Design a binder for this molecule. Structure first.
Ligand SMILES: Nc1ncnc2c1ncn2[C@@H]1O[C@H](COP(=O)(O)OP(=O)(O)OP(=O)(O)O)[C@@H](O)[C@H]1O
Ligand SMILES: [Mg+2]
Ligand SMILES: [Zn+2]
Lengths: 161, 83, 38, 94, 158, 103, 210, 8, 1111
DNA sequence: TGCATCCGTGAGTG
DNA sequence: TATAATGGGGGATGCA
RNA sequence: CUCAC
C-alpha cells in the first residue's frame, strides 16, 4: 500500500500508535502529546521514539499536485557558478603541482585523496616510495609549507572558501 | 481539395509540428506506424530540436556569407599563386 | 515594414499569421466567428 | 537609429545577409584583439569614460563602421574556411 | 488644455429635439392605444425614431462645438485624434442614447440624461446590462481569437 | 550532424536492447538508509550511479575507474547524469496491448 | 493506466483524492504537455521584469533600465570588466563583492556603464500579439525601480501606464546582438508589417500639442 | 466495461 | 470642521449590519448560546437528526454542546492554529433485542468558530467563507430548444442530495422521463404509485392528446409490485430484481430523506408553483406498505396544461432572483458536517456488526476521523474558503459581502456562458450591477447591495416603503424578487410633501421594466438610491456622472488601498464612510457612557457610568494577510467624558471615524512634457516631504531547524568561514536583534547543517590541508534576506521543542520567525488611483520649483493628464475636483449623496463663496491684478469663457466658477497659455508597488525534470519566453537570438555552463548543444514504446545521448 | 447519433 | 492455522 | 484570487 515499503511488524507498530492516540483523543477532549502517547504505550516508549516513529511513518506526496514540483529546485546538478569555481579551484591548484615537484605533489594526492578518493595514511603511502612514516611526513610538510609561502604572494586561494 | 487550417496543420508532412499542435496521440501513433521521418524543414521542428531555424540569419541563402578585408583577402591570394 | 522588396529569409508565414491574429485578439478586448468559420 | 542603416540595407540583397556579415566581422575583430581592423585611429569608434576617450569595446559597432567604409568584401564562395582562419590568425596573433 | 464640467457644452437644440421626439412618440402611442398599429410596428418605429434623434443631437453637439467653441478641449481632442470619438463626446454632452436589454433587444425608453447632467438610478441600472454583456463578450471571445491565432501560426509556420 | 528525426515502433527486443536490467520489485528506496532498493524502481545497478564516479558501497570512488562495474554491489562508476538516460524494463508474463493502437 | 490514464473507463487515483495520476500521455500532450510547455517555449536566464513608465527624454532607440536590474542581467560581463580594471582581484571575489548590498562600491556602477556600451536589450510585453511585441532598445541606466519606455512605441506594445509591466532579455552573442540591433531595433521598425502603414506615429499629447 | 461487475 | 451635506431624500431605515450575512448564518447554524432544549431543527441539529439514529444494535442521538476555545483568537493567529471549539454529543446505545442501555458523551473533534467581524482563523491565517449563489431547488418548466411547441419539466433538489429529473415529452404523445442519463416512459413509474387508469382520467382529463395519450395498456396490466420490478430491471442491468432490493434502491434514491433532499426553500417553491402542499423534502414516500406520491402528479398536471392555453402556467426564468438562492456560510458548513457525519455512520455500521454484539459502548463504537477530516477539508481546501483580503478595513467587508457562482456544487469556468453572467432585472436592489471583477470572472463573482439581506430560504430581500393611496408610510416591506414582481414601485426621489407623493406623474417600475405612472397607481417606493448598489460603489461621489465601466474599476480599486500613515477622509463624501468604519470593526468605540480613565499608545482605560473600569488593548502594528500593517491609534485624552457609541480609537486607514483610504491632494488637470503620457501621473516632491503617501509594510521570514539522519540543525551564532561584519546585528543565540537595519544578503537567523557524503572531495581536501584550516562538518544554511527585500526588525518569535506549551511537527526541532517591517514612501513606479477609475504609475517626481503653482505661490501636488478623461467618460472626478477646489478655501468637507448629491448651481454658489477668499484677500493686501493674468484673461476671453468688457475680478470669478484658475509654470514663471482646472481630489495609493515587482536573474534554481529555470520572484525564477515570444523572434528572423533563448539561457546544461564560463572570462559564447528537455522528450517517448531516432543525412543514427544510453 | 478533443499570453500571492 | 461466514457502493466539430 | 491586454 505504501510507496515507501515498510516491514510488516513496523506497520503493525504504527497502527498501534494510531489506535492508541485515537483512544487518548477520544477520552481527553483534545489531541494527545508525544508524552501522553508514550505513557499509554507502555514501557520502553518515550516521546522521542514516538516522534521518530511518526517521522518514518510519513507518506510521500506527489509532485504533480495542483504544479507542486515546479517550486522545487534541483540541488544535485552543479550550477554555472558552482561549475565555474570548481573549475577555477582545480586550475589555481595544479598551479601548485608545478611549483612543488612530481613526487611532492603526489604524497599530497594520496594523503588528501586526489587519486583514489580515499585518504591513504603515511603508512600505506610508504609502500609507494619506499620511505617510512617520517620521511613521508617531512615530504608532506615540505609541500604544504612551501605552498603556504606560494600563498600571500599570489594570494589566489584565500576567497576560495 | 479544400482543407481547414487545423486539419491542414495536422496533415502536414512533419510529424513534430503536427504533434506539437493538436491530437498528439493520434499523430504520434500513425507517425510511428509508417516509420515517418521528419526532414526538419519548417520552424517549429528546429525549435523543438533547439537548432537554428531556416529563416532570417538561419536561412541557407545568407548562412554562409563570408567577410574578409582586402588586406588579408590579398594576403592569402599570394601564397595561392605559385607552389 | 520597410516599403521595399522583401529580404530573402523573411519568415512570411509567421508574419501573416500574426498579422491576421493581432487585430482579432485586440478587436475583442458576427465578426470573429465568421472569420474562424472561413 | 543606427548610423547609415539605409546605406547598409542598400549594400545587401537581404538584410539578414547584412546581419550575418556584421556578426561574423564582429567575432573576427573580437578574437584577434581588434588588430585586424581596417579603420584608422581617427575613424576608430570611441567611448567616453571617466578617464577619457577610449576605443569602443562593442565590436558590432566596429563591424558596422568598417562595413560603412567599404573596406570589406562580402559574398559566397570567396575563400575556404580553414585557409582564412589560419592566415588571419597568422597575420594577427591571439 | 484642461477638463471642466463646463467644457461639456450642452447644445441648445437638445431641448427642441427631445420635445419633437416626445410628440412623435405620443403620435405612435396614439397609433397604438387606438389600435392603428400593432406592437411590432410600434416598438420598431420607436427604436428608429430615437436612433434618428440621437444622430440629430450628435450633429448638434459637434456643430455647436465647431461654430462657437473651436478651441474647446473636448472638440480639440476629438477632432485632432488625441482622444475620444463622436459617440463618446455625444454621451458626454448630448444624451447617453438607447440601451441594451440582457437578451439583446433594445429598451424603448432611452437615457435622456448625459454625464454632465447626471443620470437617474434607473437609467444607470439599465445601462449596466449592456456594460455587463460587453465585458462578458470580450472575456469569452478573447480565447477563441488566440486559439485562431495559434491555428494560423501552426498552418503557416513553414 | 543531425538533419533527420525518425520515429518508429519499438519491438520487445528493441525495448530490452534499450534496457539495463529488469525491474522485479515495486520497491523504491530504503525506508531507513534512504538509498535505493536492490532490483527496485531506483536501483543503481540498473539505472546508474547516484554520485559522480562513485559506486554504492563506496569501493571504487573516483575517475580512475570508469566503466568498471563494482563486484560487491554491482554499480558502474560513470557520470551520475546517466540516471536521466539509461532505460529500464519490465518483462510481463502474458503480453498486453498498447492502449494507443487499440483505442 | 501507465500509458494513458483515464483513456478507457475510469482514471486511477491515489487514495484520498479524486485526482487522476499523471500518465505518460498526460505528460506529453495538452497545453501543459511537454511540447507546448518545454519545447516551444522555455523559461530563460538573463531576463528580468518590472513595472514600466513613460520616458519622454529617451530617443527612439532607447529605454530606461534600472541599475539594480542591469546589475544582475549583466553580471557575468561585469565580473569580467571588474577584473580588466582592478575593482576586484578576480571573478570569484568580484561576485562575492556584489552579494551583499552594502558591499557595493561606486566604481562598480561605472564599470557597468563601460560594459553595456553599444549592446542592446529586448523589451517584451504580454500578450505578444505580433512581431513588434518584442523590440530592441539601447539601455540607459536610471535610478529607482521602474523601466522607462519610449512614448512612440507604446502603440505597438499596446502599453499604457496604468500598472503595466515588461520583461527584459539580453542577447549574449555577437550574433544575437547584431540581429537585435539591425532587425529588432525600434527605430528600424517604423512601419507596420501587416499593412505597411506607420506604427510609430504621434499620438495623444504629441498630437494635442502640434 | 466494469471489472467489478464482470468479475461478480 | 464644517461638514456640509446635500440631498433632500429622507432615508428611513439605516444600513443593516453589513457583516450579518455571515454572522446571522453561522450563529444560526451552531446555536451555541441557545439551550439544547429550545433549538430548532436547523443547521447542526438537522444534521444530527438526519444521520441518526443508526440502524444495524441501535445507536441513538440525544443532544450536543459546544465548549470554549482552548486558545484565543490572537493566540491562534500567533501559533499557526485553528480558532475552534471542542464539540461533544450525548449518544445512547440501545439493544433492540435485549434493551441494553449504555450512554456516553463522545468527543467528535473541534469546530472552527467565526470571529466578531465574520471571518475565520484556520492554521494561523485569517480566511473568509464566501456565500454561494446557485439555482434554487424546486420544479421548473423550460421550453425544449429542439422542439418549439413542447416543454421540458425539471425537478431540481439540493446539490448532492438527489438527481435531476426531466419530463421531456418525446415525439409520441406520451411523456417520458430521464434520470441518471437513462430514459424511460413515465407510465411505468406512474403505475408504481398506485395510479389506476381511472385516476388519470378523473384527476387530469382535459386533453385527449396528452391525458389519454399517456395511457398505454401494455403497462397498466400489472400490479404496483410487478411494475416496480420492471422499472428496477430498466434502471440497473445486472442486479437481480429482488423485491427487497428494488424497493431499497428506489426509496433510497427518491423517497428517502437521507440521500434525496429537496430544499425547504425548494419545498415552498414547489408548493407555490404547483399550487399544492408538501409533507416533506422528498418526491415520494413509503407509507402503509406501499409507495405514495406527492410531486410527480401535480408536476405532470402543470406540465400538460403548459402545452395548452391555460392561465397560471408560465415558463420560469432560471436567472431570476426568485428562482436563484444564496447558500450562506452556515448552510455551506452544514453540507460538510452532514457528509462527515454520514461517513462516521458508516464506521459505526461496520463496527456494530463485528466485535461484540452486547459488549459495546458509544465511545469505542464511534470514530470521528471522517468528520474531523470533513470539516478540516471544508476549511482548508474548499474553493469558497479564501485567503482573507484584509488590506484595508473596506476590503475585508467587501470580501465577506461578495457572492460567488463557482465552487463545488456550482458552475465551472467552462460551464459559465453569457446568461448567468448578465445583470438580471431582478438584481435591482439585491446584487450590485457595478461590483464585479474584470476578466474571466465577470458576472460570476458579485457583491450584495447595501440595503439587501438574505432571508431564511436563501433568497435576497430588498426594502420598499409602502404607499397607500398617496401617503408614503414609514413602513418598510422587504420583498423577494417574485414578491417584488407583484406591485408598482416608484423611485425614491419622486417629489414628496411631508409623506405625500407630490409628483403629478412618477417614474415607477413594474416587474423591473420602467413605466411612467400616476401617484394613485403607486403601491410602493424605493427606500433610497443607495439600495441598488454595493458598498464600494456607494463610496463613489458623483456616481451619476461616472461611466459604469470605470465605476466598476473605482470600486475594485478602493479595495486595494494601502493604509496610509497620514490617511484622511475625502473632502467629498457620500455618507457611508462612517458606517463602513463602524461595521469593519477596525475602529474602537464606547459600549456605555462614562469617562476615560487613562490613554496610552498600548491601551485605553475607561471608567464607565456603571463604575466598572474597562481596559481596551490597542492592536499595535499587526501584520495583516497582505502585509499592510493594521494599527489602531487612540483619539481621546485623559479625563474626556464619553457617551455611548462615541469613538475611542482609529483603525488603519481611518480618520476620526471616517474611511481614510487615500489622501486629499491639490491636483491640476493638464498635460506635462510627456510625463503624463497615457494615464501616467506626475507628483510633487512636497508629497514625500510631509510624508503623504507613505505606509508601513510588514513581512515575516520563517525558518525551521529539524532532525536529520546526518545530524541536528542548530540555531547558532557560529557560522563557518564568516566574519563579525556579517554577524553584527545578531544576538548570542544567532537571531537578529530587535531594532536593526537589514539589507539583501544579511543574516536574519543563523543555521548550520551537516553535509552528507559531500565530505570534501580531495580537490577540497587538498585545499583545506593547504590553507591550514581544516574542513568543518557543518555548513552555512542561514536565513538571509531576499534581493529587493528589507527593513527594520520589530519582532522575533522563537518556538522550540522541549519548551513548555509548544510541540512542533514530527522531525522539526525549532521554528523561528523574524518580523521585518518597513516604511515605504511613494516613489517612481507606485500605482495611484481615485474612486472614479482614473489610475496610473508615478512617472516623474519633480521638485517644488518645477511644479505649476497658483499666483499666490501655492504649488499643486498631482498633475493628471486630461486625455484620460474623455474616452473613459468618468466626469465624476471633475465634479469632485471643482467642489474640492471650493473645499480647499472654505476649509470645508462635503457629503454628496449617491444620485441625490450636489448639483451644479450649488457647487457654483460654494465656488462663488470661495473666490472671495481666494481673491478678495489680495486686493486689500496691497495687490491688484498681475500682468500675465491679463494675458490668460485675454486668451480665455477668446476661448469664450469670460465676458468681454468686464473687470479682471469679475472675469477671474467667471473662471473660478468654471473651476479654472491661472497657473504659473515654475520652470519659466510665464503663465500657462490658458486657465487650468485645479482642485482637491481624493487619491489613494494602491497595493501594487515597484519594490515588490522589480525582479532580475542572471542564473539560479532550475526545475528537476526539465532543467529549466523556475517561475516566480520568490524562487528567483526566470521569465517565461512562451510560444508567442518565439513567434516574435521567428517573425523578426533573429535565429541566433532564438537559439540562445532555447538553449544557453535555458536548459542546455553543457552550453549554459560553458556560456557563463565564457562570459566571465571575456570570450564569445560557445555553439549551443541539444536541449536536455528534448532528451527528456525522447526518453518519455521510449517509455511509450516508440523508437525516436535522430538520424543524419544518410539515415544513420546519431547519438545525442553521447554513449550514455547505449550498452 | 456516440465518442473524443479542443477551447489566448505573461506575471503576483498564500 | 479449524464455531460459521460464499455476488460492491457548455459547445461545437470531426469522424464511424 | 489579483495585475496587464
Ligand atoms: N493562483 C491562485 N492564487 C490564489 N488563489 C487561487 C489561485 N488559483 C486559484 N485560486 C483559488 O481557487 C479558486 C478558483 O480556482 P480554480 O479551480 O478556478 O483554479 P484551478 O482550476 O486550480 O486552476 P488550474 O487548473 O490552472 O490549477 C479561486 O477563486 C481562488 O479562490
Ligand atoms: Mg495597461
Ligand atoms: Zn561498489
Amino acid at each position: 500500500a505504501r510507496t515507501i515499503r515498510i516491514p510488516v511488524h513496523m506497520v503493525e507498530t504504527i497502527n498501534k500508535l494510531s489506535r492508541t492516540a485515537r483512544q487518548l483523543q477520544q477520552e481527553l477532549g483534545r489531541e494527545p502529546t508525544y508524552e501522553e502517547i508514550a505513557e499509554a504505550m507502555g514501557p520502553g516508549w518515550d516521546a522521542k521514539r514516538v516522534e521518530e516513529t511518526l517521522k518514518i511513518a510519513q507518506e510521500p506526496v506527489s509532485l504533480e499536485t495542483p504544479f507542486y514540483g515546479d517550486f522545487i529546485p534541483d540541488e544535485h546538478l552543479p550550477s554555472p557558478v558552482d561549475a565555474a569555481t570548481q573549475s577555477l579551484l582545480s586550475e589555481e591548484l595544479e598551479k601548485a603541482l608545478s611549483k612543488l615537484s612530481e613526487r611532492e605533489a603526489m604524497v599530497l594526492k594520496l594523503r588528501k585523496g586526489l587519486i583514489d578518493g580515499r585518504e591513504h595514511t603515511l603508512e600505506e603511502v610508504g609502500a609507494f616510495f619506499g620511505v617510512t612514516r617520517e620521511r613521508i611526513r617531512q615530504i608532506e610538510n615540505k609541500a604544504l609549507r612551501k605552498l603556504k609561502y606560494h600563498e600571500s604572494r599570489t594570494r589566489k586561494l584565500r576567497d576560495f572558501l | 481539395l479544400l482543407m481547414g487550417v487545423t486539419k491542414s496543420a495536422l496533415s502536414t508532412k512533419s510529424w513534430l509540428s503536427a504533434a506539437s499542435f493538436q491530437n498528439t496521440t493520434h499523430v504520434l501513433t500513425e507517425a510511428a506506424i509508417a516509420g515517418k521521418k521528419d526532414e526538419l524543414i519548417g520552424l517549429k521542428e528546429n525549435v523543438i530540436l533547439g537548432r537554428l531555424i531556416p529563416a532570417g540569419t538561419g536561412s541557407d541563402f545568407v548562412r554562409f556569407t563570408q567577410v574578409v578585408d582586402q588586406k588579408t583577402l590579398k594576403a592569402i591570394e599570394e601564397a595561392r599563386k605559385e607552389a | 515594414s520597410m516599403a521595399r522588396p522583401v529580404s530573402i529569409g523573411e519568415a512570411v508565414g509567421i508574419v501573416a499569421a500574426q498579422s491576421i491574429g493581432e487585430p482579432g485578439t485586440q478587436l475583442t478586448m458576427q465578426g470573429l466567428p465568421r472569420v474562424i468559420e472561413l | 537609429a543606427e548610423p547609415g542603416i539605409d546605406k547598409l540595407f542598400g549594400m545587401v540583397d537581404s538584410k539578414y545577409r547584412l546581419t550575418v556579415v556584421v556578426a561574423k566581422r564582429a567575432q573576427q575583430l573580437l578574437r584577434h584583439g581588434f588588430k585586424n581592423t581596417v579603420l584608422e585611429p581617427e575613424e576608430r569608434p570611441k567611448m567616453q569614460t571617466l578617464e577619457g576617450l577610449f576605443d569602443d569595446p562593442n565590436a558590432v559597432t566596429w563591424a558596422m563602421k568598417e562595413l560603412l567604409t567599404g573596406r570589406l568584401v562580402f559574398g559566397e564562395n570567396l575563400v575556404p574556411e580553414d585557409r582564412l582562419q589560419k592566415e588571419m590568425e597568422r597575420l594577427y596573433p591571439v | 488644455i484642461t477638463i471642466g464640467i463646463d467644457d461639456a457644452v450642452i447644445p441648445e437644440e437638445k431641448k427642441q429635439y427631445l420635445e419633437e421626439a416626445d410628440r412623435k412618440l405620443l403620435q405612435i402611442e396614439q397609433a397604438y392605444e387606438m389600435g392603428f398599429l400593432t406592437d411590432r410596428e410600434r416598438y420598431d418605429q420607436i427604436l428608429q425614431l430615437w436612433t434618428e434623434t440621437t444622430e440629430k443631437v450628435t450633429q448638434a453637439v459637434f456643430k455647436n462645438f465647431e461654430e462657437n467653441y473651436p478651441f474647446n478641449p473636448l472638440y480639440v481632442m476629438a477632432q485632432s485624434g488625441a482622444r475620444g470619438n463622436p459617440q463618446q463626446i455625444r454621451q458626454l454632452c448630448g444624451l447617453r442614447g438607447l440601451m441594451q436589454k440582457p437578451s439583446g433587444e433594445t429598451f424603448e425608453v432611452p437615457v435622456r440624461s448625459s454625464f454632465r447632467e447626471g443620470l437617474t438610478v434607473l437609467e444607470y441600472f439599465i445601462s449596466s446590462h449592456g456594460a455587463r454583456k460587453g465585458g462578458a463578450d470580450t472575456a469569452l471571445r478573447t480565447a477563441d481569437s488566440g486559439y485562431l491565432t495559434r491555428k494560423l501560426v501552426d498552418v503557416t509556420h513553414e | 550532424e543531425v538533419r533527420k528525426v525518425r520515429i518508429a515502433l519499438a519491438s520487445p527486443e528493441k525495448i530490452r536492447s534499450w534496457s539495463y536490467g529488469e525491474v522485479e520489485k515495486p520497491e523504491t528506496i530504503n525506508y531507513r538508509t534512504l538509498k535505493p532498493e536492490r532490483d527496485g524502481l531506483f536501483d543503481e545497478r540498473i539505472f546508474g550511479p547516484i554520485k559522480d564516479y562513485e559506486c554504492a558501497c563506496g569501493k571504487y570512488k573516483r575517475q580512475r575507474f570508469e566503466g568498471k562495474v563494482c563486484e560487491r554491489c554491482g554499480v558502474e562508476v560513470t557520470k551520475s547524469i546517466v540516471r536521466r538516460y539509461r532505460m529500464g524494463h519490465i518483462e510481463l508474463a502474458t503480453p498486453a496491448a498498447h492502449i494507443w493502437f487499440v483505442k | 493506466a501507465l500509458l494513458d490514464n483515464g483513456r478507457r473507463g475510469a482514471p486511477v487515483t491515489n487514495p484520498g483524492s479524486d485526482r487522476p495520476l499523471r500518465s505518460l500521455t498526460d505528460i506529453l500532450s495538452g497545453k501543459q504537455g511537454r511540447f507546448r510547455q518545454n519545447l516551444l517555449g522555455k523559461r530563460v536566464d538573463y531576463s528580468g521584469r518590472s513595472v514600466i513608465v513613460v520616458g519622454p527624454q529617451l530617443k527612439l532607440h532607447q529605454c530606461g533600465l534600472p541599475k539594480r536590474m542591469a546589475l544582475e542581467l549583466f553580471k557575468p560581463f561585469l565580473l569580467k570588466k571588474m577584473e580588466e580594471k582592478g575593482i576586484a582581484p578576480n571573478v570569484k571575489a568580484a561576485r562575492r563583492m556584489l552579494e551583499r548590498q552594502r558591499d557595493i562600491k561606486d566604481e562598480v556602477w561605472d564599470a557597468l556603464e563601460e560594459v553595456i556600451h553599444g549592446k542592446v536589450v529586448l523589451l517584451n510585453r504580454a500578450p505578444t500579439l505580433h512581431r513588434l511585441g518584442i523590440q530592441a532598445f539601447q539601455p540607459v541606466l536610471v535610478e529607482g525601480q521602474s523601466i522607462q519606455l519610449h512614448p512612440l512605441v507604446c502603440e505597438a506594445f499596446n502599453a499604457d501606464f496604468d500598472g503595466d509591466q515588461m520583461a527584459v532579455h539580453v542577447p549574449l552573442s555577437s550574433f544575437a546582438q547584431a540581429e537585435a540591433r539591425i532587425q529588432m531595433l525600434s527605430a528600424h521598425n517604423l512601419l507596420s508589417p501587416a499593412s505597411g502603414e506607420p506604427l510609430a506615429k504621434p499620438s495623444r499629447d504629441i498630437i494635442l500639442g502640434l | 466495461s466494469d471489472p467489478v461487475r464482470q468479475y461478480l | 470642521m464644517e461638514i456640509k451635506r446635500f440631498g433632500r431624500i429622507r432615508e428611513v431605515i439605516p444600513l443593516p449590519p453589513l457583516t450579518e450575512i455571515q454572522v446571522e448564518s453561522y450563529r444560526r447554524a451552531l446555536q451555541a448560546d441557545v439551550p439544547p432544549e429550545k433549538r430548532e431543527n436547523v443547521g447542526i441539529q438537522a444534521a444530527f437528526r438526519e444521520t441518526f439514529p443508526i440502524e444495524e444494535l441501535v445507536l441513538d442521538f440525544l443532544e450536543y454542546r459546544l465548549g470554549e476555545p482552548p486558545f484565543p483568537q490572537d493566540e491562534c493567529r500567533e501559533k499557526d492554529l485553528t480558532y475552534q471549539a471542542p464539540l461533544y454529543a450525548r449518544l445512547q446505545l440501545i439493544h433492540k433485542d435485549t434493551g441494553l442501555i449504555k450512554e456516553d458523551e463522545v468527543f467528535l473533534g473541534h469546530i472552527p468558530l467565526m470571529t466578531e467581524d465574520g471571518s475565520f482563523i484556520i492554521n494561523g491565517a485569517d480566511r473568509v467563507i464566501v456565500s454561494q449563489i446557485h439555482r434554487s431547488p424546486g420544479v421548473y418548466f423550460t421550453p425544449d430548444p429542439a422542439r418549439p411547441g413542447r416543454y421540458i419539466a425539471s425537478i431540481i433538489p439540493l446539490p448532492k442530495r438527489g438527481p435531476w429529473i426531466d419530463l421531456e415529452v418525446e415525439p409520441n404523445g406520451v411523456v417520458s422521463m430521464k434520470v441518471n442519463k437513462r430514459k424511460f416512459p413515465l407510465v411505468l413509474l406512474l403505475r408504481v404509485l398506485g395510479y389506476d387508469q381511472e385516476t388519470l382520467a378523473r384527476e387530469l382529463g382535459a386533453y385527449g392528446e396528452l391525458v389519454q395519450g399517456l395511457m398505454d395498456e401494455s403497462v397498466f396490466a400489472m400490479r404496483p409490485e410487478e411494475a416496480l420490478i420492471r422499472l428496477f430491471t430498466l434502471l440497473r442491468p445486472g442486479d437481480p430484481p429482488k423485491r427487497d432490493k428494488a424497493v431499497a434502491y428506489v426509496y433510497g434514491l427518491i423517497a428517502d430523506p437521507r440521500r434525496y433532499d429537496l430544499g425547504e426553500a425548494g419545498r415552498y417553491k414547489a408548493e407555490e408553483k404547483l399550487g399544492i402542499r408538501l409533507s416533506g423534502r422528498t418526491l415520494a414516500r413509503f407509507e402503509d406498505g406501499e409507495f405514495k406520491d406527492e410531486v410527480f402528479l401535480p408536476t405532470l398536471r402543470y406540465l400538460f396544461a403548459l402545452t395548452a392555453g391555460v392561465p397560471g402556467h408560465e415558463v420560469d426564468d432560471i436567472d431570476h432572483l426568485g428562482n436563484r438562492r444564496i447558500r450562506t456560510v452556515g448552510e455551506l458548513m452544514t453540507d460538510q458536517f452532514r457528509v462527515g457525519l454520514a461517513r462516521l455512520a458508516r464506521g459505526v455500521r461496520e463496527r456494530m456488526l463485528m466485535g461484540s454484539e452486547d459488549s459495546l459502548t458509544p465511545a469505542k463504537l464511534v470514530n470521528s476521523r471522517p468528520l474531523e477530516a470533513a470539516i478540516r477539508e471544508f476549511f482548508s481546501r474548499s474553493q469558497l474558503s479564501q485567503f482573507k483580503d484584509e488590506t484595508n478595513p473596506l476590503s475585508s467587508l467587501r470580501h465577506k459581502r461578495r457572492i460567488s457562482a463557482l465552487g463545488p456544487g456550482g458552475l465551472t469556468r467552462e460551464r459559465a456562458g453569457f446568461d448567468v453572467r448578465d445583470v438580471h432585472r431582478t438584481h435591482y436592489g439585491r446584487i450590485c450591477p457595478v461590483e464585479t471583477p474584470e476578466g474571466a470572472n465577470i458576472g460570476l463573482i458579485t457583491s450584495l447591495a447595501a440595503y439587501a439581506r438574505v432571508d431564511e430560504l436563501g433568497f435576497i430581500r430588498t426594502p420598499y416603503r409602502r404607499v397607500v393611496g398617496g401617503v408614503v408610510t414609514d413602513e418598510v416591506v422587504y420583498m423577494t424578487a417574485t414578491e417584488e414582481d407583484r406591485y408598482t414601485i416608484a423611485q425614491a426621489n419622486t417629489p414628496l410633501e411631508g409623506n405625500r407623493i407630490a409628483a403629478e406623474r412618477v417614474v415607477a417600475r413594474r416587474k423591473g421594466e420602467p413605466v411612467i405612472v400616476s401617484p394613485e397607481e403607486v403601491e410602493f417606493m424605493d427606500v433610497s438610491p443607495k439600495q441598488v448598489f454595493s458598498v464600494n460603489t456607494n463610496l463613489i461621489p458623483f456616481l451619476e456622472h461616472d461611466d459604469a465601466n470605470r465605476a466598476l474599476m473605482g470600486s475594485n480599486m478602493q479595495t486595494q488601498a494601502v493604509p496610509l500613515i497620514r490617511a484622511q477622509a475625502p473632502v467629498v463624501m457620500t455618507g457611508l464612510e462612517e458606517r463602513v468604519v463602524r461595521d469593519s470593526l477596525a475602529a474602537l468605540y464606547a459600549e456605555e457612557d462614562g469617562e476615560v480613565a487613562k490613554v496610552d499608545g498600548n491601551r485605553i482605560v475607561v471608567r464607565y457610568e456603571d463604575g466598572r473600569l474597562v481596559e481596551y488593548p490597542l492592536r499595535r502594528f499587526y501584520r495583516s494577510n497582505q502585509g499592510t500593517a493594521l494599527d489602531q491609534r487612540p483619539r481621546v485624552v485623559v479625563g474626556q467624558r464619553v457617551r455611548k457609541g462615541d469613538l475611542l480609537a482609529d483603525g488603519p486607514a481611518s480618520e476620526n471615524g471616517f474611511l481614510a483610504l487615500g489622501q486629499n491632494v491639490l491636483v491640476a488637470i493638464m498635460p506635462f512634457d510627456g510625463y503624463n503620457f497615457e494615464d501616467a501621473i506626475v507628483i510633487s516632491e512636497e508629497l514625500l516631504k510631509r510624508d503623504f503617501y507613505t505606509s508601513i509594510h510588514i513581512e515575516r521570514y520563517e525558518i525551521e531547524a529539524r532532525d536529520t539522519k546526518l545530524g541536528p540543525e542548530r540555531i547558532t551564532r557560529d557560522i563557518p568561514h564568516l566574519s563579525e561584519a556579517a554577524l553584527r546585528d545578531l544576538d548570542e543565540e544567532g537571531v537578529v536583534r530587535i531594532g536593526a537595519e537589514v539589507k539583501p544578503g544579511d543574516i536574519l537567523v543563523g543555521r548550520t547543517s551537516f553535509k552528507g557524503e559531500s565530505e570534501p572531495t580531495p580537490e577540497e581536501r587538498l585545499l583545506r590541508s593547504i590553507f591550514g584550516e581544516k574542513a568543518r562538518d557543518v555548513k552555512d544554511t542561514s536565513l538571509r534576506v531576499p534581493p529587493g527585500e528589507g527593513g527594520i526588525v520589530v519582532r522575533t518569535v522563537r518556538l522550540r521543542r522541549g519548551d513548555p506549551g509548544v510541540e512542533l511537527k514530527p522531525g522539526v526541532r525549532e521554528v523561528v520567525r523574524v518580523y521585518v517591517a518597513q516604511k515605504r514612501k511613494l516613489q517612481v513606479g507606485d500605482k495611484l488611483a481615485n474612486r472614479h477609475g482614473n489610475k496610473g504609475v508615478v512617472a516623474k517626481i519633480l521638485p517644488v520649483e518645477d511644479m505649476p503653482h497658483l499666483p499666490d505661490g501655492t504649488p499643486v501636488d498631482v498633475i493628471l493628464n486630461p486625455l484620460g478623461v474623455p474616452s473613459r467618460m468618468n466626469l465624476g472626478q471633475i465634479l469632485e475636483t471643482h467642489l474640492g477646489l471650493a473645499g480647499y478655501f472654505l476649509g470645508q468637507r462635503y457629503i454628496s449623496p449617491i444620485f441625490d448629491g450636489a448639483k451644479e448651481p450649488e457647487i457654483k454658489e460654494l465656488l462663488a463663496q470661495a473666490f472671495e477668499v481666494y481673491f478678495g484677500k489680495r486686493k486689500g493686501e496691497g495687490f491688484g491684478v498681475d500682468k500675465r493674468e491679463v494675458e490668460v484673461l485675454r486668451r480665455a476671453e477668446k476661448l469664450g469663457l469670460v465676458t468681454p468688457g468686464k473687470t479682471p475680478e469679475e472675469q477671474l470669478k467667471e473662471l473660478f466658477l468654471q473651476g479654472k484658475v491661472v497657473l504659473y509654470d515654475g520652470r519659466t514663471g510665464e503663465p500657462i497659455e490658458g486657465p487650468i482646472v485645479v482642485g482637491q481630489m481624493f487619491i489613494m495609493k494602491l497595493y501594487h508597488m515597484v519594490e515588490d515587482k522589480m525582479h532580475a536573474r542572471s542564473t539560479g534554481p532550475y526545475s528537476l525534470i526539465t532543467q529549466q529555470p523556475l517561475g516566480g520572484k520568490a524562487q528567483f525564477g526566470g521569465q517565461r519566453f512562451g510560444e508567442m515570444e518565439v513567434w516574435a523572434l521567428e517573425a523578426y528572423g533573429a535565429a541566433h537570438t532564438l537559439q540562445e533563448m532555447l538553449t544557453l539561457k535555458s536548459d542546455d546544461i553543457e552550453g549554459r555552463n560553458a556560456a557563463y564560463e565564457a562570459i566571465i572570462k571575456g570570450e564569445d559564447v560557445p555553439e549551443p548543444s541539444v536541449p536536455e528537455s528534448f532528451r527528456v522528450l525522447v526518453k518519455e517517448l521510449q517509455a511509450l514504446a516508440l523508437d525516436v531516432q535522430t538520424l543524419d543525412e544518410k539515415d544513420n543514427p546519431v547519438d545525442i545521448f553521447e554513449g550514455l544510453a547505449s550498452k
